[PDB]
Design a protein around this ligand. Structure first.
Ligand SMILES: Clc1cccc(CNC2CCN(Cc3c[nH]c4ccccc34)CC2)c1
Ligand SMILES: Clc1cccc(CNC2CCN(Cc3c[nH]c4ccccc34)CC2)c1
Lengths: 328, 328
């Protein structure tokens, strides 16, 4: 059911943004319609996992001490959810510019800029009189900066060659690039709108967000290599791109000197046979044995930290449980 | 003299940003040094016109009702100045991405993102306890959105063909794309730090910013066409790019049906002879006569509006005069 509410609030945000351009920024109808279409193309289609997490946190926090406050909290949760979905839309556009007087490139750069600006525009309007507006803006922008920093860690992982191919550096990339905006931010925004931010142990929450991010990334990295092409997914290019993947860092700790030498000579190449040699190396190293156990250990840690969180924040722990269920 | 202070505050901002990454964001020395170099390459070298304008406004507002407040206002003026210089650095990087697993493109996208995030990071830190922080952030982000909107008006001026080649649409592009962040924003930030924002007629100020922007753009457009290549400047491509320039909109209102037809068949082409045909058309249409008079009329309007501003905001009008002197 929260999906119907989330989509209704999208119509409300879209109409505000588009009317603001038409009425305050001198926008002609042709450009307004172009922006409506661009917003729909970039912001709709996904699973809305980050957005829906905000809704789920707010409704759980109504249980622990209905009226005029309830309606407001749920509406606020939906606007916050769209801020994260538009920020995600902004990141995807920026990633698509990497797919390599070109009007498509000009428009993609511009779309990226507008989608980011729209997160600030919708916040400043819908939360104009809220006392949490300043803290919300500063936490949102710090997470956005964290993601850009995470992107630098990722993009330069193979540059200065395999010195940064460690589990602790893998965890640094995961934390900054994905965990903060995908797991921590939706949870924090749900706490902000509910005015229940100081009532939770931030340490355990951050640790849970980082762990769920790490669980998801290991699974994503494994699927990037072994999940069949357009049969069971999308195009996996981590091997070709020489990414600091969980498979790569685990292989380097389990491989012999000669196998490491063989991995180094075949990794980071577009050549089909070199990619296949890497896949054969992962298979022969019994990394799928290690994958199962790594994930199971992380899962045990997640399940344990939710219990510590439940002792002082019960309603919140059940929303952290449903977010985890979506990952597990 | 304000340049020495502006550069000293740059060292202070740079060290804060870089140390924050090292101490709070787990950044390794190699990446910290890479970011120091990138910040220097993108933020230094220019004339610092936008940045220095903030300093000049604040020092003028100390004259109208020294102590602990003076030192603070001038430091605040310098941080605001660097926010605009870094935002300008962000726009230039974004424009350079338009110059068309590429690590240069990955890094340019990332640099763009970091430079924008740095404007928010330096503001949230240096103005942490200031009551103007929320208003400053919202005005800065609205000007940033305005610039992205201006970029859409510019990039699509020749698309939907010459229906948008009007003086009023030219003025719309100038206002949003350049006037708000180059003229209005430095003036507004100097007012914010001086806590003198409601003491000025915003209407006359906005009008002055738009007029100074329009004066500058007309001169810039004329130079883009007639200023010799690397002899007296840089590479001018408005004709090839089919830009909605002042020369193009003025020519279309002064040209005969056959000349308009000749302009339409030769505009927006990379071919050297078609560009030369356009230059010949501008020369033959005596647009240089019109240019002199257009600028002189705008100058008279600027000089008149400063007087209306001086009646209620005297110190401010003299800083608006020096900003104008830099343009004229
Ligand atoms: Cl955070 C981090 C840290 C270190 C390295 C990386 C590398 N990132 C790749 C990016 C592409 N895949 C997604 C994907 C592609 N093909 C699939 C098939 C099936 C399912 C998912 C996919 C995820 C892993 C990320
Ligand atoms: Cl805002 C707006 C509105 C409509 C159209 C435009 C077109 N913009 C061009 C951009 C490039 N030039 C700068 C430049 C290039 N060569 C030179 C030689 C000498 C001096 C300056 C230059 C400015 C004009 C902008």
């Amino acid at each position: 059911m929260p999906m119907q509410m989330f989509m209704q609030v999208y119509d409300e945000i879209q109409m505000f943004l588009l009317e603001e351009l038409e009425l305050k920024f001198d926008m002609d109808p042709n450009r307004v319609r172009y922006l409506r279409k661009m917003m729909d193309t970039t912001c709709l289609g996904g699973k809305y996992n980050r957005g829906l997490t905000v809704i789920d946190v707010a409704e759980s926090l109504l249980s622990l001490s209905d009226g005029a406050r309830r309606k407001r909290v749920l509406h606020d949760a939906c606007v916050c959810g769209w801020m994260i979905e538009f920020l995600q839309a902004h990141y995807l556009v920026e990633d698509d510019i990497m797919d390599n007087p070109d009007v498509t490139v000009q428009c993609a750069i511009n779309d990226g800029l507008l989608l980011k600006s729209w997160t600030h525009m919708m916040a400043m309007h819908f939360f104009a009189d809220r006392p949490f507006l300043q803290d919300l803006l500063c936490r949102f922008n710090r997470v956005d900066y964290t993601t850009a920093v995470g992107q630098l860690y990722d993009v330069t992982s193979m540059f200065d060659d395999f010195a940064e191919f460690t589990l602790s550096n893998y965890k640094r990339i995961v934390k900054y690039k994905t965990a903060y905006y995908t797991y921590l931010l939706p949870l924090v925004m749900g706490l902000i709108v509910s005015e229940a931010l100081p009532t939770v142990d931030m340490g355990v929450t951050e640790e849970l967000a980082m762990l769920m991010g790490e669980y998801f990334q290991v699974q994503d990295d494994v699927m990037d290599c072994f999940t069949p092409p357009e049969r069971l997914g999308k195009v996996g290019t981590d091997i070709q791109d020489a990414k600091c993947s969980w498979l790569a860092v685990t292989f380097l700790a389990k491989a012999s000197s000669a196998q490491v030498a063989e991995f180094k000579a075949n990794y980071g190449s577009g050549d089909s046979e070199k990619v296949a040699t890497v896949r054969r190396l992962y298979e022969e190293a019994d990394l799928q044995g290690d994958y199962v156990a790594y994930e199971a250990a992380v899962a045990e840690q997640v399940k344990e930290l939710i219990e510590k969180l439940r002792l002082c924040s019960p309603g919140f722990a059940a929303s952290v449980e449903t977010l985890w269920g979506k990952t597990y």
